[PDB]
Subunit: 263 residues, 5 copies
């Protein structure tokens, strides 16, 4: 299956940013959701599309390989390393833009509370498994959500399989990486839950993640395409009124790739 690395135009780099998809409720609110409203009963949960943060995905074309007929073997791009970080972490220091004061005469409350920080690099679409907080939640038109939901969907219903293959579509609260698949992807995520959780965001151009498995093989890019996926829900912004909106930020990716021969 996997043979030697090519040396000597044998390496390439992908550098890009993925924008967040927090719901964008009007022309002025890119990076924010709609304010969160709470259903009157548990069974009537019915979130609007613009209140639901979704997974981000980019498919990046790589230099075309195998332009001439080959015999029993091909080249594939192998993703070897990743640098990543959240872009615009200092924007969360704006505590003066019509937020809710911490106390009388105080500054605005900063973005804080529940966060999900997630990134993946793969040679194909991230494979997802559905899990629902509430199987009677009515998910809205324009989203791709677990179908034929049962009470078992609240813990594990193996019917709920999907590919992260569309932007602004797969709600964060419905889907996770499928650990039974993703052989050709490396994924990393942290959920920090709680209304008062402080954002802790590190930036450096000195940190590298190695994407090689225990056999020294990185993701292999099918069709000369690289799949990047992210979520960076940083917390909620609290308006003067008390209403709360999810706030997301963009994620930087730099991936180094090498040509690998495979049978």
């Amino acid at each position: 299956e996997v043979l030697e690395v090519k040396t000597g135009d044998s390496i390439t780099e992908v550098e890009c940013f993925l924008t967040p998809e927090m719901g964008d409720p009007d022309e002025h609110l890119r990076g924010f959701s709609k304010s969160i409203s709470i259903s009157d009963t548990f069974e009537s949960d019915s979130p609007n599309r613009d209140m639901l943060p979704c997974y981000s995905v980019a498919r990046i074309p790589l230099p075309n390989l195998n332009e001439d007929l080959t015999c029993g073997n091909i080249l594939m791009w192998e993703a070897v390393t990743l640098k990543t970080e959240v872009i615009g972490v200092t924007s969360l220091m704006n505590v003066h833009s019509n937020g809710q004061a911490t106390h009388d005469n105080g500054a605005g409350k900063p973005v804080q509370g529940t966060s999900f920080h997630f990134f993946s690099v793969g040679g194909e679409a991230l494979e997802l498994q559905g899990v629902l907080f509430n199987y009677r939640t009515k998910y809205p038109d324009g989203t791709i959500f677990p179908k034929n939901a049962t009470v078992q969907s609240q813990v594990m219903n193996t019917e709920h399989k999907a590919y992260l293959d569309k932007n602004k579509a797969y709600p964060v609260e419905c889907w996770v990486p499928d650990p039974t698949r993703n052989e050709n992807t490396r994924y990393f995520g942290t959920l920090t839950g709680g209304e008062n959780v402080p954002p802790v965001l590190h930036i450096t151009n000195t940190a590298t993640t190695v994407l090689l498995d225990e056999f020294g093989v990185g993701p292999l890019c099918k069709g000369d395409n690289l799949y990047l996926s992210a979520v960076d829900v940083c917390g909620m912004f609290t308006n003067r009124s008390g209403s709360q909106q999810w706030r997301g930020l963009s994620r930087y990716f730099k991936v180094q790739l090498r040509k690998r021969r495979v049978k």
Copy 2:
């Protein structure tokens, strides 16, 4: 007596989900407990079965071998559905006027084990006068000494939806043939911190390079993943649990 590892047909892998057992108080509430109620005295503590999270267990039959035994070498594991806890809109309690719903938070217990036989348990009671309900398996002949250590309370995790998390722990005096890991984080306001990655492996070999050996060609997987409590609009609180993924690599080992 443990001899050489077979090479070549000599490896297998187990992959599965263990669903949580939080109490499931009605046909809509898989993954949740009944809302929690408080006794007015220690002597009147009588929790209903559907208010008690229990240990999860699966006995997984392996390919029949016979001697040779399956040896568990490595584990990948993670909690499945961590993002579901971002639902802050399903009739929860607003943090403040016009605010979002309070997220799942508070006391958690995250636990998993891999063994070649049932997890061995030791009983310890918060309150020795607690009356545990019909259909649970609980420390019997409890005394005030049961609040710190009573060696009578020995059991095997040999039944699903049976062994309440609050009365049992892994027995550190046994479990020679099991590897176990758990963390209790206590407090009504503790934030869930849940990591997911397909790049993390736990090695199950002891200091002598021997992994759990599967008696009768059976692998035992155990879990608890109490994530915290959900607060309803009324203020009532239910435990919330999530499923745990296990991938175990095994190899054939000659013994005796």
Copy 3:
């Protein structure tokens, strides 16, 4: 003079649990203290015996040996027993809010363990030198205001159970050459317990010279405190709650002169 390790009959293991000594104020409350009450002044601080957690200790005899041979402690596995009991939030606790669950055990904790070839050596330090400690405890005597920072008179051995109150004694860092000790104080009213359990973790007890505790008279000394925090009952009154500690120690025969 420490000489060679014996190989081959050369090894033994000790396995046991130490119960917590929290004060046990009645026949139903083993593992709890009395409810905490507060003095009106520093000079009137007068805590009752059943309100003071104490250090736990076991002296464990080893196989008789008699360059001479001595038992050398090399490795320790340890963990808190019954961490999941702290999930009982339905037993006369104070609701965290209207219709809510009981407040779990939380706040000030002390988790400590030591392994030695002789009794743990203690130094007394008092929060308040005017505290009147109760009959049946062993406490710093002839206390002065200097006892609030460092009075070298306050030297003791942890040589008795249910006796040495946690708040007036610490391991003496000027002694304890023949013991290995480890402790964490986490202070504050709302601190969450964080309790880890696993049978895969070992502590090596060898010093920088490759030498472990050497057991005088073939006795091993195990000490512990596991104050996990406070339990708040329906009335708001607070009690210390403790749990037992498991120890497993591997020992080997060492020749000495």
Copy 4:
């Protein structure tokens, strides 16, 4: 093309401190911002200059290299190591002046809440990317801010490129290090957000950061100049009235450099 390190006057050291630039609202309040005011609407956000912390920067001249004509080769100073620390951490124990009591008869509230701790060492100016919390924020005269802002500026507008080439000018909340550039700079930053986050400030003269990349090459100093950049927003001070001011501290740098031949 990087060649061999010169040995033997082949080494030099830079030592200095960067003062913080928090806004300095009067002649007594060096190191503090103006008290924070909250806009009446999200659209009307218009912070005053003395309410905005800015990035700090110093450019340090090194011993002059290449005084004689050379042929195809030059020497450059290469930055190899950094010692850095926040100067004055114990000042935050002043809880006895002009403060708001934590409770009846209690001590003053200490400096706490949102912090940004950042430093960089480079052979040229730090390259910046603009990200705005609110694209309709009116930034004040005397600051250098992202121009021609659009709603996209709330997540990622690639027009917003700058150099940290002026002190007291680039607002912290507008700008981050550009991860798509900065090949010749090493940067490190942490945003800890939240109204009540406690400052955690470590000092030691025993800690060293190595500035070499994966090829053993540090920042190379163009024109024999070293660029140091810092932000140390420690949190907010709370007045008796409840009014809150950012508080910053100075940062110490010690950089060891060696002469490197390059072709």
Copy 5:
């Protein structure tokens, strides 16, 4: 100094001692505590009482006389805070956390600091408020200006006296202290929990990147410490700093120098 070979064989010595804390000691019963903390109405009126100000602790330890000369080189340190369990006294004139509750424990701003040097710790002055009037009996930054709130290079001192150098206006000078190793953490916040570790198993190596430790000038070793653990809240709500002693064990060896 040219640093030459280490002596082997009579070539080692050790120093073991404790430094008491200096929190202000406002009466004959309150050793280890400051005076209750009060709040001036303005920066201009900030006039802290001497017994309300914690100070750096220092000990100069004479070593065995040695004298191309030999100097004692500090190689390793074991250190810990003494009496951590004393903070479990929540029954002594404390403010109840809630109705019928236990006393509020020591919590809030802490500073834990220690240093080992072959000469006095070098200090740099930094003022929260340049208009603070430091009291008679303290050694404080002189000729303060508004620049003293960020960096005024005039404010240079030696930690050369006890009960003198207030913690809040002095830090180790990072521009000097070549011949010292220093370590400190400030943990701010009104409600921060103390987290105090003890063990006799932890050693700090004091050698720099060239394998050289502090070299003791005139055969004197300088130990310095601060252990402000947080504040104690009494029944009225008034708050006092509380400190604890620090243990030091330093191993030293003879080093030839020119």
